[PDB]
């Protein structure tokens, strides 16, 4: 999972 | 939701019977509201005689209840609600969820809670309602019987083995959708639907003190009954090397993989947010490094990827998957285990971990200071996600501060440790997908473990470093051609230039182009051209389209087009080549330049070719023995006698070289070309660019290619080969007819009136028609009215329906009313006016005009096509849509 | 009829072609693409 959206 | 609303105020409470509820108050928009209730039960909770019951109960609580004996859904219909837009439900393994978006919003709140309380506390679940609903449940069942589900089930069977999940699919079985009695539903309902097993969330323009009294009004009296304790959401992890085949005889899947299963929510004493952040860092680093490892793969594997997925409440699976040239799975699994082994030897690239960590710190910094504001639909999506896993929302502003604090205690040493635990997991799986009839016997576990120890002892190269990114630029063309003639059609705003290399330019100066240039280059270079090899030429076309110029690469191309807001693409049909592109007027030299470079300097990206070879080889292996393959082969000998061309054997495919493909491309690119240009700009601007990039491409006269024309006569065939319980009825019919704009519109009008009547003749449901469609056009290059009618239906009905459609066609010409036509004419008339100044239509018609008239006349007098629509002319044309003398029927039945 | 459907996923854009008569996810599984008009997922 992504916890901090980056792009 | 046009004015973003800030972080809302949360209020949560618990009724005396255990019913839990969350109120989230937005500032706006006005009146909008969203209501949701989760019952913590799903198909994983079913027993053995309860297949698909969780999902059937989902349906059934909308039918009779204590307050609404005619059905809960029907009360909602009578108050203006709509299925799918105003209420819906979803059932997965772990939960059942009920969604409400009341048409009048905040006002309908107590009407909504009355309905939810009826559904969850007072469902009658009557056998007579069940027997009516079964019709709908079977339809949902029958719809998801394709090859994608059967493989999805294969994946769940293997990656989640030793768990409840494989034997408990949501939809259940056909037998239990037919035979399970409503008393089994009531026992399930009465075990699981109790308030301490339920939770409710309300989002929007609401008064929290008021919404809470309503929740008491409709849910507080529910009896407080306990549901069974549960501790079975989790596969039983044990040390092992399990080996599994993922198989379906209609799947082209050709892949191998090695998987590690483990408890992913164990954080080992540290911050569990910090842990989840280590996961993201680790995956981003692994995703970079595994990509580079493409260089290390033998010819038999490609596209090595790492995927991490939840396969329970706490266990995740880490997987390395790669695609396999059919036949080379043993070699491919060795390569996967080799690369897994390399990741055990060497730590992850520290500049990756520094860069990735920094990108995350950047976004978390920004998050920690900008107040969170969202549109309504966004708030719901965010809050629903956190609420489905029974956790309180944490603001994006607060989450940024948490991430910064957890990044401070995280160095690459931690990332490597995190990654090494996954790889040290003792529960391991190896999966194989081998398409079609490819010889395969499943490895035994030691045969795999042997490979693991072979690569454990081997000496291994370090991880690959990042290659530096080649940024491409088009060459300088100084070479100029010359325009040699000009024919003018001022009345269409069209000029037609001849060019010194033989090409020509049909330039239309349409103001509808705005500041963009629209290019369509056509030519007689289809993959059936005499000089070419049909399968090689299509693959050359596809690879060039994707690789770009020879010195470039697929990725650098996609980059370069995006920076220039430019598109250009190759379409090589059987009879024609078409390159299609758009660019801003500014970038006209870039578009013509890119076009010239595809023609004179085409590329083949090594990686793209390798991927495409595998895509072709797995489909060949599948299609040699798949149902889809046998239908296409019978349809061909029914309609054409012989295949016009055929894909190659896998062995020949494996030997194809980039020089042999480029050879094919140049035959196509040498055909003389007509550039249909739509641009609003003076000729003095367009002429120099056309003489430099377009007029200087070497060309050589090509012959027209013969169309693939359906043979005339009456042939029929039946095949019992379908694997799902369905019959497929297709029939084809043509009538040679000369193309005129009118005749084409008359045919499409008649096909509309045809389309609705062949529905009357065949709306008796006792005929069990799942889906049917009817198609008819005056095809302009073939110059014949071509008609296609197709049914999918139950097998027993199946041979009566063509008989009745046939009859419905004989009847049709005397059945077209007048107010059918002039309602269609009014329909056409208005649809036409939508099409003026529509650039897609202007471009389509210019090209068509030159195809039939060799001038641009069809750009004018569209206003007088509507008047070809009279009743006498649509009847005379509806008599021609089906021709009994040219008829091909193909019936596919379930395999007996 | 025969229509170009295309999937955007977190690794690439990978082409499949899908008759009118055919569910888009079935044409992918028939083509050997692993996932779970231009739709995005």
Residue numbers in the entry:
A (entry chain C): 134 to 140
B (entry chain A): 26 to 921
C (entry chain F): 2 to 37, 86 to 90
From the paper:
The crystal structure of FusC from Pectobacterium demonstrated the structural characteristics of an M16 protease and further revealed a plausible import mechanism for ferredoxin, an iron-bearing protein from plants. The crystal structure demonstrated that FusC has the four characteristic domains of an M16 protease, creating the entire “clamshell” structure from a single polypeptide.
MPP is chemically inactivated in the presence of EDTA, which chelates the crucial zinc cofactor of the metalloprotease. The catalytically important metal ion was identified in the FusC(E83A) structure but was absent in FusC crystallized in the presence of EDTA. After coincubation with ferredoxin, crystals were formed from FusC(E83A) and/or EDTA-treated FusC. SDS-PAGE analysis confirmed that both sets of crystals contained full-length ferredoxin in addition to FusC(E83A) or FusC. The structures of FusC:ferredoxin, FusC:ferredoxin (C2H5HgPO4), and FusC(E83A):ferredoxin were refined to 2.7, 2.3, and 1.9 Å, respectively. In these crystal forms, peptide densities were detected that correspond to the plant ferredoxin. These peptides define two distinct binding sites for ferredoxin in the cavity of the FusC structure. Taken together with the fact that these clashes occur in the region of the ferredoxin that is not resolved in the crystal structure, we conclude that in order for FusC to bind ferredoxin to form the FusC:ferredoxin complex, ferredoxin must be distorted through partial unfolding.
